[PDB]
Each structure stands twice: as C-alpha cells, then as structure tokens.
Design a protein around this ligand. Structure first.
Ligand code: MG
Ligand code: MG
Ligand code: MG
Ligand code: MG
Ligand code: MG
Ligand code: MG
Ligand code: MG
Ligand code: MG
Ligand code: MG
Ligand code: MG
Ligand code: MG
Ligand code: MG
Ligand code: MG
Ligand code: MG
Ligand code: MG
Ligand code: MG
Ligand code: MG
Ligand code: MG
Ligand code: MG
Ligand code: MG
Ligand code: MG
Ligand code: MG
Ligand code: MG
Ligand code: MG
Ligand code: MG
Ligand code: MG
Ligand code: MG
Ligand code: MG
Ligand code: MG
Ligand code: MG
Ligand code: MG
Ligand code: MG
Ligand code: MG
Ligand code: MG
Ligand code: MG
Ligand code: MG
Ligand code: MG
Ligand code: MG
Ligand code: MG
Ligand code: MG
Ligand code: MG
Ligand code: MG
Ligand code: MG
Ligand code: MG
Ligand code: MG
Ligand code: MG
Ligand code: MG
Ligand code: MG
Ligand code: MG
Ligand code: MG
Ligand code: MG
Ligand code: MG
Ligand code: MG
Ligand code: MG
Ligand code: MG
Ligand code: MG
Ligand code: MG
Ligand code: MG
Ligand code: MG
Lengths: 136, 59, 76, 98, 188
RNA sequence: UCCCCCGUGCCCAUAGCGGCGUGGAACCACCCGUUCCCAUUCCGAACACGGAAGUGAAACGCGCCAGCGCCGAUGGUACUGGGCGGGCGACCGCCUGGGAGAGUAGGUCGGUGCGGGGG
RNA sequence: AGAGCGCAAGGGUAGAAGGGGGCCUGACUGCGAGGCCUGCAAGCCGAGCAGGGGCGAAAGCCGGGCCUAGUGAACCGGUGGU
RNA sequence: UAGCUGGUUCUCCCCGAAAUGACUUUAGGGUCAGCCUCAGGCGCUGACUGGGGCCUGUAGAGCACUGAUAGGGCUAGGGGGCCCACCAGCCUACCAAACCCUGUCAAACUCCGAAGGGUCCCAGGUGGAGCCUGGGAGUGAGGGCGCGAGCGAUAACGUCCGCGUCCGAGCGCGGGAACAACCGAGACCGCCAGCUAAGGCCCCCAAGUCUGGGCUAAGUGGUAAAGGAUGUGGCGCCGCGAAGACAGCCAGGCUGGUCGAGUGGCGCCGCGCCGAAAAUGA
C-alpha cells in the first residue's frame, strides 16, 4: 500500500455515492446501514463464502479498506493515536454493493451471500440484476 | 404595493440575532402586536425571514 | 509527538472589490503568485501585490488563456 | 515570439508596428485600447521603388509626414519579431529624421 | 414493447412519485417533452424491456412513439427508479447497447473453471429496422486462461460496432477455493 | 458596398488536433547568394543584408469531413440559506427558497474589429 | 507544461519568473502620496519627486534575488566618521 | 509582605457586561484591544432587508492531477517446464511496471461546484441604532443544547475549535412528575375580568369518559441490539387447481381413485412477539 500514515475520521453523511448496481456476477449483497467495515471483516466473509461453496465460482469484492484506523494503547491523551490496531476499514454508506458472486446457482448464492452478511457488522439485503443499467 | 398587516405570534426568545433585528426592523416590539406596512421588496425581505414568527395579511 | 507546529496566518486575498472607489496606491490584491494580473492603472510589486495607480473604480477581467486582470477605470 | 510587443503595449500609447516582407516593408501606427490604426505608410505595396534600406528610410518619412498632420509624436516603436538593426531600423530611423 | 405515457407540466416531481407515476422525459434531435409512465407498469415493461428492445409509447395524443430507454436514474438507498430517459428514434442510424447471448460450454468451465462475462451486452451503431434481438458468441473453444475480445463478434448484416474494436467481451477465469485458503493464510 | 490578400487587435478550444482539397495575377512564404552592415558556444539552420531565376513541395491563407479534443442542455437527483417532524440512538423524513456534478439529447473544423494593397 | 525556477511546502509561472549571451553594479543617496495588516510595538506593498548613475536605438526597466522563512525591543558597550 | 482566602452596613430610578485576542518566569495575576455605562459632539449613517456587481473553493460530485484500489485485458521484467550453449526458441489456471476497460476511495487529490458567506453601490430601516472625542468600569475559570470538524473508542455530564442560542445575570412564571440552560414566555404595580402559548381535557388534576376511520392484545404503549418465529392485519408477484389441485385416507412404485374448493412459496408496509439477569420495596 501507500500515501500517508493516519487520517481523520470524518462523518458518514447521506447514503449518497454510497450505493449503485450489481456490476459483475449474478447476485449481489448490499449495505442498508452506514459503517466502517474492517478488513478482518471483509476477509472474514470472503473465506466464509468459498469455504461454504468449495471449488466455487468467482467472488468480487467491491469495497476496499483505505481508511487507517487509530487506537491509543490503554493510557491517556498525548498526541494522535498509535492507531492501526484494527488497521483499516472501508467507509460504507447505505446502499453500497460489497460482494457479489458469479458462476453459481440461485441457492448457492442465496446462501454464500447470506452467510457473509452474518459475518458483517451490519444489516444487508441481497440482489439480482433485474435490468437496471444505462444504455438505450 | 397594498398594505401588509404583520402580527407577531411566536416569541423570538431563542432565534438568531438577525431574526430579532428583523422584528426591530419591521418595528414589532411586543407579542401579539399589530403593525401595517407598504409592500416594498425591503419590507417583504424581513417579513419573509420572520415568517415563522408572524402572521401576515394583505390590506 | 513531533507535530503541532505552524506559521502565522498571512491574511491574503482581494483587498478591493469590483466597483469600489480607491485612491492611488491602494493595495488591490495580495497574492501567492499571479492569481490575478495587473492591467489598467494597476501596478504590482515584489510580493505580487497589486495596487491602484490612480484613484478610480476597480474592475475584474476574466480572459481565460491570458488569465484574470484587475483595473482601475479612472474618473474625476 | 513577440514578447516585445507585450512590453511595449504596457507603456501606454502609439505603437509603430513595423511589418517587413522580403521585398516589402509596411508600417502601421496602431493606437491600441480600441483596436484602430492611425496612419498606414506601407511601401512596396504602396508606391516606392526597390532598394530596401533606402526604401525603409523613405517610408520612415512616410508615416512622419502623414502623422504630424494629425497629432502624433510618441516614437513608440514595435521593433517587431525582427531584431532592430537594418530595414526595420532605418524605418523608425527616418520617422525620426522628421 | 408498448407502454402508456402521459404528459406532465407543473406537477411536483416528488408528489407524483407518491402517486406511483415514475416521471420521465422524451427527447431527440427535434423533440423534448415532460412525461410520466406508471411505475407498477414500467416495471413489467422494462423488466423484460430494458434498453435493448424498443418501446413505442402512447400518449392520449394517440401518437405512438419509436423510443427506447436512454438511461434511468435509480435512487440510491434501496434500488428503485427515479426518472426515465426516452430517446425518440426516427430512422437515421442510432447507437445502442445490443445484447449478447453466450452459447456453448467452453473447455474451461468443463475442467472446472468460470464463465467470466465482461459485457452481457455491447454498443453498436444501427438503424431502427435492425433491432437485433441479440448477437451470438461462439464461446466454447474458450479455456481458463483465454478470453474472447471484441474483434471476434458474429456481427449481423448492416451493423457496425461503436465500441473500441479491441475491448474484451468475456473471458474464462479459474474457479476459486481452498488451494487458496491455506496459501493465502500464512504466505502474506 | 462585395470578393481575395496583408498587418494587427478583441472573444477565449463551438478558434484546436488530425485527415482530403485547393490559391501564386497580387500578397506571403519558401527561394539565389554571403561582398557590405549583421550573425552562430558549429553551421547564413536562426538572426542579417543584397537580391536573377525557380516554387507553392514545406510554411501560411481559404475550404470540406466529427476519429480525438472542446463546448453541452432539458428532465431528475445530491447538497443545501430558512422553517420543522419522528425515534431510545449512528441517523432518517416533510414544508419552503436555492440547486449541482456526472450522464443523455446535442453542438462544433469559428465569430469580429481597425487599417493597407489588389478586380 | 507533468520540467525547471538555490533549499521545505505551497500559490505562481515558458505570451518566463526558466537556459544562454553582451554590456554593467539601482545588493544607490535624499525621500515618500496611498494602502495592506494590526491591541501595542512591529511587519508588508508602494506610485511618484530630486540628485547623480547603469543597460537599451528607444518606449522604458533598475532602490538586489518567482514569491512567502533565513531572526532579536531597549539598555550598556565596540569601530569610523560630520 | 500576602498576585491568596474571608468580610464590606440605608432606599428608589435608568442602562447593563465578560468568562475572548494579543503579549506576559504568564497561566486562579496583569497590559492593550473586545463587550457595559456616563458626558459633550455629528445626524440617517445602524443592525436586519431589496436590487446590483465583484470575491470564494466547503457540502455535493469527480478521477483530468497526486496517490490509493478490486477484476479483466493487452503487455516489458521475473520465476518454472521442453531443449542444448550454433543462445536463442516455445510454452507458462505463477508475481507483475507502464497501458486500456469495467468498478471504485482520499482532511493535507480537483476537470468541476452549490446553496451560502464577505465586501462596495443604490434603496428602505429614527433604533436604549450608528459614528467621533472624553470620565468610570467590570471581565479576561464559563456551562449546557443545536449544528460543522479535530481529539477520543463516530465512549464519557470527556475534551478542543467554529456558527447560533439559552443559563450565567431570567434557581422569576407555564409545560416536562420532580430538574440552570428541552418546549412556551422576557415578570413596573394592582384585579374574585377576558384570549391564548407549550402542554393538556378518565380520577388525584383545571378542561371531551368529544366525533369519525383504522391498527394492537403485548401492559406493547410504560421507551435495548444483531438475529429468530405458521403473531396479526394490509398490498404485490410466481407455481399446481373444477380436465378435480393441496390435506389426509385405499392400492402400487409419481399413478390411480375417493373427497371436492381453493392451495403452496416469495416479496413489501403497519402494530406487535422473542432475544431480556442485579443487588433496601415496588
Ligand atoms: Mg449483522
Ligand atoms: Mg424558545
Ligand atoms: Mg423602524
Ligand atoms: Mg495550534
Ligand atoms: Mg518596482
Ligand atoms: Mg522579485
Ligand atoms: Mg525591484
Ligand atoms: Mg477592438
Ligand atoms: Mg493459455
Ligand atoms: Mg464517439
Ligand atoms: Mg494540401
Ligand atoms: Mg492546384
Ligand atoms: Mg508562379
Ligand atoms: Mg567577410
Ligand atoms: Mg499543400
Ligand atoms: Mg466559411
Ligand atoms: Mg471535453
Ligand atoms: Mg467535456
Ligand atoms: Mg448540468
Ligand atoms: Mg453537467
Ligand atoms: Mg482579422
Ligand atoms: Mg482573424
Ligand atoms: Mg479581373
Ligand atoms: Mg546577465
Ligand atoms: Mg504613509
Ligand atoms: Mg504607508
Ligand atoms: Mg518607485
Ligand atoms: Mg532620475
Ligand atoms: Mg546628470
Ligand atoms: Mg520591472
Ligand atoms: Mg533571474
Ligand atoms: Mg537594562
Ligand atoms: Mg547595561
Ligand atoms: Mg565590544
Ligand atoms: Mg434595561
Ligand atoms: Mg493550568
Ligand atoms: Mg496568580
Ligand atoms: Mg453601510
Ligand atoms: Mg479513470
Ligand atoms: Mg490476471
Ligand atoms: Mg492477464
Ligand atoms: Mg517445477
Ligand atoms: Mg496502471
Ligand atoms: Mg460542468
Ligand atoms: Mg445566496
Ligand atoms: Mg450570494
Ligand atoms: Mg424618534
Ligand atoms: Mg488570564
Ligand atoms: Mg458528548
Ligand atoms: Mg448535558
Ligand atoms: Mg439572556
Ligand atoms: Mg376534572
Ligand atoms: Mg370515546
Ligand atoms: Mg363514545
Ligand atoms: Mg389485531
Ligand atoms: Mg436475516
Ligand atoms: Mg427485530
Ligand atoms: Mg411471522
Ligand atoms: Mg419488493
């Protein structure tokens, strides 16, 4: 990775850009609530996914932890946090599409994706593809 | 610009400084107080800002 | 830590705006470079300070490619 | 290039835009700040012979005579893309002669 | 397909949606007009419809219009359509995303592997007569490691591909599993 | 008045990039030459002077295409001065005045001054 | 224009503030309309007048350096002067 | 000596703060500024507002720069296998620069960019407005709430700034059970008059056991989550069904009959259920 050290917290405003449409594989998993999702959380789901459906299709992860996450070590107030204990997170607004699978049955994905949302710290809904795009 | 008949119905104690000055501009001292004024853009301008405080009427 | 250090505020910006009378010498704009440019009756000095060259009203020109200029349109 | 022209225009008034062709040598006296020329003492595409330097000097007295009968006097000289030295030189040079 | 349009002027775009009418707009080199299909309907229409097949739109002007959905703004926060772009066709050539049907099972997917399908459709310049209900893709000789580009398409008569002639269309990527749960664990 | 050229400003890519075409009477360029004035960290490439003949190939001038670039609505939304509402909370919602970016439709191989030579 | 612009970062910038040359020392004296900034003290910009100069044919430009850091009241004392 | 603590006595009337900046062997002290007040000036300039120009880089957005980034492509470099030094050749579900595509992220990124804010002009605005010169001040511990950020743990009746507000000084009055700052409202005095505000109108307790339409059976309401469930009502879609379905019942391994009208699954809204253990009596 790169860039610089540690970074503000900021707020999590309206769900705005935070959200869109399935954009690879068949089914999707989308965020209802706002959240910092931890790498240890992503990766927790990632595995829980495959490990569920072995020699599986393709899982696309479309959220990514560029936010470094600080945390002072059981002391008191002098300077910014050492930080990084939980390392990094992904800012995730209501509506964002985190993971989607491809190469699978409706009940394979309706499971994989189901399990995952469990591993996540948030409330999530699952998605198809309907038609919704942009073209003519 | 017919007459405007502004009455003060909600107390300003707790609205922004401006909003109080607004009423002072329009010339409203006390609550439930009658005050009639020319419908110029300027009078309107303030009368709008305190809209939530007054009840306007066209005369 | 090793931080919490900084340099006092430099209070720079457009000092006179479009359509203000100004005397000669009036600093018109204080600036980081040529964010603005001189022009008509408007000199500029070591730091890039722009300043009236005769009393009169100020106006602001945008000129794309050429950049933005500021002038005094004199009168008396 | 033309850096010069910028430098001149700054001064204030009365540019003498000396253009010069391989057989010719025109010359406007442009009052900027309105986009108009005042006099236009061309040369080869005007009237005069074919000897260049002596031509320039002659067209110098061109603008000269043409000018005073109007009011001009600021020698303000567009030493255009050509470096002042010869044809261009003589040009303003004659404009000074009178 | 066909869907009953309506005209719209002053109506509060937002107050409309509460009713059920998904606002929208029809426009083309000469035309531009405020409208509003019905949502429950547009759904069904557009569910199958999308932006490949045309939709002729009926106003109480009786006018059947030769249009298709140029773009639809979905509202973030639980998907839903906000409002609709309707490109009135005429007859001159017009660009548009025509589908792609990937047919046949490749060498890849057999020995375990995965249907990667970059474009479930593609953009081509074409006149309205040619509404090529789709395009074929000889996906079968494909292998995990191999990928069919754009310059390799079964192009119907008279149709010209508007996209770059080198965009990839699909590809066959490896599956994914536990030869990557052990290795992905300690190694990193 | 009109048409082409030349010098020159104004608009600031809807002037531009690239491609086809064309103009040498005039105008301009390239061009002949390096004795004089003048010139290169080496060169008459550039500046400079004197100028047959040749040329419009390059350059530039005028046109014509929309591949790149550039310009780009409308509709809708985000956001949001001001005013409010629910809930236990990170937050969510309405009223009112403002309203994008991106994306579609689309446009675009310029507009125009003053002066000069030429039919 | 993503380079360069002595050095940090920034803003500026080739229609030069960047590279190279020829001549030069205005890294002047006497001043200073008028402003920026500001509790105070301080800091900053500055046309123009005079004196005598520098480069330029000239219009003109020069009161150090693209700019913004590179510093220290007052006392007491050192050196040189009218 | 005490930059500390304590104490400072009659009445009525008008106005009325501050708890901030700068410096400070300064940090619970001071000096100048800021805010209060008094006197003498000036006279429509004042807050607020309308129109008008200018100036700006946030929210939002965006990826053109700086970086970050998942998948794929094309593609140098590497590692591995065939082959051998006539060094090259070929492959490569290996890592991967640049590049393109799809998809994205950023306080110290911006091709863009709001509302808004600042200022000057013209206009309304005679106000316990405004300017100018002076006498006297106190203040220079603030706090809470709303909004925008930092810190913190997107903890704290935490902390630190910004805009605003109220308490401070309105622990005066109404509401909120009680309660500085939440809601209402700025208490000159009197009244055994009236209208209201917030909040309320079954009793304690003033005023509807008011009218109409629904929802809930938990005492929910009487205020706890991920998650769970044939709660309940309301709406939408898919599957088999009077050519006999689902449910059971008779026979065989879906088939048959008999029965005879609906049945199965998904999805969204309203109210509810579980999840739900604390110490004096509820
Ligand atoms: Mg969860
Ligand atoms: Mg209040
Ligand atoms: Mg008044
Ligand atoms: Mg600090
Ligand atoms: Mg100077
Ligand atoms: Mg300088
Ligand atoms: Mg200087
Ligand atoms: Mg002009
Ligand atoms: Mg292969
Ligand atoms: Mg195109
Ligand atoms: Mg050609
Ligand atoms: Mg020809
Ligand atoms: Mg010829
Ligand atoms: Mg010689
Ligand atoms: Mg040609
Ligand atoms: Mg034309
Ligand atoms: Mg563009
Ligand atoms: Mg564009
Ligand atoms: Mg737009
Ligand atoms: Mg736009
Ligand atoms: Mg022209
Ligand atoms: Mg032109
Ligand atoms: Mg003829
Ligand atoms: Mg030098
Ligand atoms: Mg002074
Ligand atoms: Mg001064
Ligand atoms: Mg000076
Ligand atoms: Mg002098
Ligand atoms: Mg002298
Ligand atoms: Mg200078
Ligand atoms: Mg220099
Ligand atoms: Mg001393
Ligand atoms: Mg001493
Ligand atoms: Mg000494
Ligand atoms: Mg008082
Ligand atoms: Mg302390
Ligand atoms: Mg002390
Ligand atoms: Mg004023
Ligand atoms: Mg990009
Ligand atoms: Mg790959
Ligand atoms: Mg690859
Ligand atoms: Mg091996
Ligand atoms: Mg790359
Ligand atoms: Mg734009
Ligand atoms: Mg505004
Ligand atoms: Mg504004
Ligand atoms: Mg009065
Ligand atoms: Mg103090
Ligand atoms: Mg708190
Ligand atoms: Mg509190
Ligand atoms: Mg108060
Ligand atoms: Mg009662
Ligand atoms: Mg009842
Ligand atoms: Mg009853
Ligand atoms: Mg019920
Ligand atoms: Mg669940
Ligand atoms: Mg629940
Ligand atoms: Mg249930
Ligand atoms: Mg649904």
């Amino acid at each position: 990775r790169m860039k610089y050290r540690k970074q503000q917290r900021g707020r999590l405003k309206g769900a705005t850009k935070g959200g869109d449409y399935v954009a690879f594989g068949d089914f999707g998993l989308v965020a209802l609530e706002p959240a910092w999702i931890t790498a240890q959380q992503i990766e927790a789901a990632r595995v829980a996914m495959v490990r569920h459906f072995r020699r599986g299709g393709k899982i696309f992860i479309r959220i990514f932890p560029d936010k470094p996450y600080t945390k002072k070590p059981l002391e008191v107030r002098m300077g910014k946090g050492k930080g990084n204990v939980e390392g990094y997170v992904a800012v995730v607004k209501p509506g964002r599409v985190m993971f989607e699978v491809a190469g699978v049955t409706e009940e394979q994905a309706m499971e994989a994706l189901r399990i995952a949302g469990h591993k996540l710290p948030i409330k999530t809904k699952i998605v198809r593809r309907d038609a919704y795009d942009e073209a003519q | 610009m017919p007459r405007l008949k502004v009455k003060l119905v909600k107390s300003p104690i707790g609205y922004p400084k401006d909003q109080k000055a607004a009423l002072k501009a329009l010339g409203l001292r006390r609550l439930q107080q009658e005050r009639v004024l020319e419908d110029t853009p300027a009078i309107r301008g303030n009368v709008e800002k305190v809209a939530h405080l007054v009840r306007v009427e066209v005369v | 830590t090793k931080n919490g250090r900084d340099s006092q505020a430099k209070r720079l910006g457009v000092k006179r705006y479009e359509g203000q009378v100004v005397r000669a010498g009036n600093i018109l704009v204080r600036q980081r470079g040529t964010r603005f440019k001189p022009g008509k009756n408007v000199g500029m000095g070591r730091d890039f300070t722009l300043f009236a060259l005769v009393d009169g009203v100020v106006e602001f020109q945008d000129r794309g490619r050429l950049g933005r200029y500021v002038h005094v349109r004199p009168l008396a | 290039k033309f850096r010069v022209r910028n430098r001149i225009k700054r001064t204030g008034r009365l540019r003498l835009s000396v253009f010069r062709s391989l057989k010719h040598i025109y010359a406007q006296i442009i009052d900027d700040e309105k986009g108009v020329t005042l006099v236009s003492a061309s040369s080869l595409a005007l009237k005069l012979k074919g000897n260049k330097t002596e031509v320039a000097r002659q067209v110098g007295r061109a603008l000269a005579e043409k000018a005073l009968a109007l009011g001009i006097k600021q020698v303000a000289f567009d030493r255009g893309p050509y470096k002042y030295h010869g044809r261009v030189k003589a040009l303003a040079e004659g404009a000074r002669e009178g | 397909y066909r869907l009953k349009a309506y005209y719209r002027e002053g109506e509060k775009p937002s107050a409309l949606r509460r009713a059920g009418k998904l606002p929208g707009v029809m426009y083309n080199r000469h035309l531009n007009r405020k409208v509003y299909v019905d949502l429950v309907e547009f759904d069904k229409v557009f569910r199958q419809a999308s932006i490949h097949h045309v939709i002729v739109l009926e106003l109480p002007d009786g006018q059947s219009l030769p249009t298709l959905v140029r773009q639809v703004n979905l509202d973030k926060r639980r998907r839903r359509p906000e409002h609709v772009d309707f490109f009135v066709l005429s007859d001159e050539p017009v660009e548009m995303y025509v589908p792609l049907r990937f047919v046949g099972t490749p060498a890849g997917v057999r020995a375990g592997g995965v249907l990667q399908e970059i474009h479930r459709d593609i953009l081509v310049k074409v006149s309205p007569r040619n509404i090529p209900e789709f395009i074929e893709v000889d996906v079968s000789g494909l292998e995990i490691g191999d990928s069919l580009h754009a310059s390799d398409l079964k192009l119907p008569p008279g149709v010209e591909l508007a996209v770059s002639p080198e965009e990839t269309i699909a590809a066959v990527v490896p599956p994914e599993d536990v030869e990557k749960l052990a290795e992905e664990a300690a190694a990193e």
